[PDB]
Amino acid sequence: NTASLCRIGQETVQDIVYRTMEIFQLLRNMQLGTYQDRLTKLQDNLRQLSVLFRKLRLVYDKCNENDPIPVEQLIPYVESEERREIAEVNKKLKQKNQQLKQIMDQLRNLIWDINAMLAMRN
């Protein structure tokens, strides 16, 4: 629940950067009918950027309190039922993937046959 929060904070960081770049691009695209439309789009983008900043602050505040163990200690140099349950999902997913393989190779053969037959109908 906390690693997901860290990943969400990271993702929001990339969205913040992307939104800043998009804001600068949109300001560049403005050349003096549709001007009010661009202005409303700019207002929407700025307000959602502010909401994104608020969400990032909330995530940081939540994750800051919850370090006892430092870095560079856990790097390995040269010198219980969860596993049981996980396996079934892996096997089931693998089986599903295998089934998709049969459908895919069949559809591609069908399209190859129709291409070959239709190419020379003239």
Partner 1 sequence: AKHIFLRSRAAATIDSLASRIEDPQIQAHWSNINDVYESSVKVLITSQGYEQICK
Partner 2 sequence: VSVNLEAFSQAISAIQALRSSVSRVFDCLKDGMRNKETLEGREKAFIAHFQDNLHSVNRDLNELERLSNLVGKLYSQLLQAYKWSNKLQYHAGLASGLLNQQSLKRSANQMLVLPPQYVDDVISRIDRMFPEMSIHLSRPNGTSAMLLVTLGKVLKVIVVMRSLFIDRTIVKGYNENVYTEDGKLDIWSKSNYQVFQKVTDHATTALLHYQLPQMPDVVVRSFMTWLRSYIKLFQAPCQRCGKFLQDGLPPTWRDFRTLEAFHDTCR
Binding residues (CB under 8 A) for partner 2: these are 7-8, 11, 13-14, 17-18, 20-21, 24-25, 27-28, 30-32, 122
| From 35-43, 54-62, 69-77, 113-121, span contacting partner 1 (CB under 8 A) | 113-121
3 or 69: whose CB is closer to partner 1? 3
Cβ 70 to partner 2, closest distance in Å? Answer: 27
Following DSSP, what letter does each residue of the chain receive, concatenated? -HHHHHHHHHHHHHHHHHHHHHHHHHHHH-----HHHHHHHHHHHHHHHHHHHHHHHHHHHHHHH---S-TTSS------HHHHHHHHHHHHHHHHHHHHHHHHHHHHHHHHHHHHHHHT--
Identify residues 73-92 at the interface with partner 1 (CB under 8 A).
none
